[PDB]
Amino acid sequence: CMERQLEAARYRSDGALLLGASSLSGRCWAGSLWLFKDPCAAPNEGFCSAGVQTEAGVADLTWVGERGILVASDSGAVELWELDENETLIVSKFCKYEHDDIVSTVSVLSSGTQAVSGSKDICIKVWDLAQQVVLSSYRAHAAQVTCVAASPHKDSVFLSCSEDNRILLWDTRCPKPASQIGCGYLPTSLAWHPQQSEVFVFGDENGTVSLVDTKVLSSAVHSQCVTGLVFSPHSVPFLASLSEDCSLAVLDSSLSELFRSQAHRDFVRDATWSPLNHSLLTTVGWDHQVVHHVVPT
Amino acid sequence: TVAGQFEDAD
Amino acid sequence: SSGRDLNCVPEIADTLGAVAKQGFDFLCMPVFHPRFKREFIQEPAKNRPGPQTRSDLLLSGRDWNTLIVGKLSPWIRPDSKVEKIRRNSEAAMLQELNFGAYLGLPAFLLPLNQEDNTNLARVLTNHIHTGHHSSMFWMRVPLVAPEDLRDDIIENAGEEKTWMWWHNFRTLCDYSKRIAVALEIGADLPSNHVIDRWLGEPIKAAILPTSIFLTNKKGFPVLSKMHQRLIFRLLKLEVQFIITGTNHHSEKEFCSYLQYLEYLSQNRPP
């Protein structure tokens, strides 16, 4: 049986669906990861394509290609699992305890051979997956790192947000790699516009979503802290936002609400547009529900 | 145990 | 006289046994899951069914009273600027403190990371005046504020402030004897006067992150010749130590981090 609370739900180009879940209450606090060839079948453990247990909770995960998951563990570890050739087992590749606290999130740089992570130890670290070692570490923030987002357009650049009202852009290619970008209330989630080089959106704890250019336009969309943002795969994105109000809001390019849903009965924890039909959504929250929304577009 | 196991670093 | 301060506990029995085998004698664990945020006002989140925390039957009553030390959830911000966040933080803090008392934890850790904690003091005093004398309240506080320790990596962009934070908190709580300090040691140390003043406080525990340990020729972890003075002066105070972090010296076992700390104690000046 799988742990109740789903933590993340990430699609892959083929169409499979990877659900990382953890049991935040009860006797055991372990975690697990599941892979479904047919997303609709989930979360029934019997219909899962593959699955495995992990020693500690899965704070956040991310695909690293056609096979490979970079899992962030609350045990202060950054694990890398790799699926078998036939995609029947989730094998482990390496686990590194290089953080002194829970790892909030991890992202994969555009090149795909490197990754980044930030922890509640107010520290960020950049990893090389092939060398399975840490290249650089930065205690730039003065508080716990809340979110990290690698640029999908150009390599070696990423955004970081912390609980000290700082939004730092990074460029490791040059000395003094960190800058500061601002407009307020603490940032809580970040996303990069996929079809634009330097336009990115960030949410604040009050439920307001703002659109900024690296070289601001805001809207009140939620009544509580935004937990994530995921741009749509279309040629004209349809940014989707979820918050602790147990609500989903799909917005236009001008941050005007276009569709809303409340099928979840608890915290919505992740959403991801399907890569087979751009109209299908797929959201998971701690209510142990996986909901597919036919967003109008 | 090891000679200098607690010896001070430079 | 040492603790591990683990922020992840897959299974309580396993973690406790492993920590005991490493030479420690008490464990600093989170009573609630650090990431299990809870809502207390707005539906439907307030109706979250099922258990909210591991049952207390897992350990004998004596075990809770002596070996475990609670830690407040990291997502609780009583002094936040958002009213809903503030109320959620207050409710969560009260619930966690009440659960800690129910278990009978000898000590409980609370973090200080911001210059304003008036609401936290209010909540803590409201809790203290309930009538249970079971537990103390260690207040984590660093020597150097994070804002003064950042690596100066940003391009776009006074040491007593931490003691000012401690003083304001303890005066808000009316010098209650149940409030003690859990001084946290950073890589760099402040001037001699700051530490001398800091040693005049009721420090009950000291936190030594593994990140501050140097490396000896052989390879085992070791402290610098200036940290030794502070450790000795604390030992004179008979303060408890809490080795936190991970095995930065991966080659050696975590037990080493503590064995060295014993070498100082048995080599203390006569």
Numbering used by the authors:
A (entry chain K): 26 to 208, 212 to 243, 248 to 329
B (entry chain L): 225 to 234
C (entry chain J): 15 to 171, 181 to 293
Question: What do the authors say?
Answer:
Protein arginine methyltransferase (PRMT) 5 is an essential arginine methyltransferase responsible for the majority of cellular symmetric dimethyl-arginine marks. Previous structural analysis revealed that PRMT5 forms a hetero-octamer with its obligate binding partner MEP50/WDR77.
The N-terminal TIM barrel of PRMT5 binds to WDR77 and facilitates oligomerization with other PRMT5 protomers. The TIM barrel also engages substrate adaptors of PRMT5 through their PRMT5 binding motif (PBM) peptide. There also exists significant charge complementarity between the positively charged PRMT5 PBM binding groove and the negatively charged pICln PBM peptide. Overall, we demonstrate that the PBM serves as the main attachment point between substrate adaptor and PRMT5 and provide a structural framework for the consensus GRG motif that PRMT5 preferentially methylates.
